[PDB]
Amino acid sequence: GIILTKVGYYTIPSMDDLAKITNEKGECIVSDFTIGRKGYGSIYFEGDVNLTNLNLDDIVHIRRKEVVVYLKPPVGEGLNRKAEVTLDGVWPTDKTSRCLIKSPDRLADINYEGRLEAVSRKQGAQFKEYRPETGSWVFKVSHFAKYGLQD
């Protein structure tokens, strides 16, 4: 009953292991849950999460520099709860060459992470870090709420 078919999306524990994890009551509760889209980002939920009957395809939307959860249950229920979001491949564009900037030195010089932390503050999220190597912008949220960078 747990649906995730969009190409590139995956979960931890893997979707292939969910059947085994499900209990005699038909409940699939995992301790710590991650759902992500390779190369785009991931959302980590610490603690027990009840994935039973969740249509992850319709609920989770991870795209370049943005995430949307529930296009919605009360805060604390379902996936609308505290979580750590990671958006990958978040790099700025060189105004002249119009090519991406992956150089850690340059990213530091333009204080790119500063721009990202400012956006997180505006969106009510708690900025955690920016990993230049993979353009990974990590921030904690208390609910969803849409997050991301609108260049």
Identify how many contiguous H helices and E strands the chain contains and give both numbers. Answer: 4, 9
Resolution in A: 1.9
Contacts of 147 (CB under 8 A, 6+ apart): 66, 67, 85, 87, 120, 123, 125, 139, 141
Number of domains in the chain: 1
Distance between CA atoms of residues 132 and 32, nearest Å = 26
Contacts of 6 (CB under 8 A, 6+ apart): 37, 57
Length of the chain: 151
Output the six-digit token pair for 35: 């759902």
For the CA atoms of the chain, what is the radius of gyration?
Answer: 17
State the structure-solving technique: X-ray
The residue segments making up the domain with residue 42 are 1-151
Nearest alpha carbon to residue 144 among 55, 53, 66, 31: 66
Domain with 2 in it: what CATH number?
3.30.1610.10
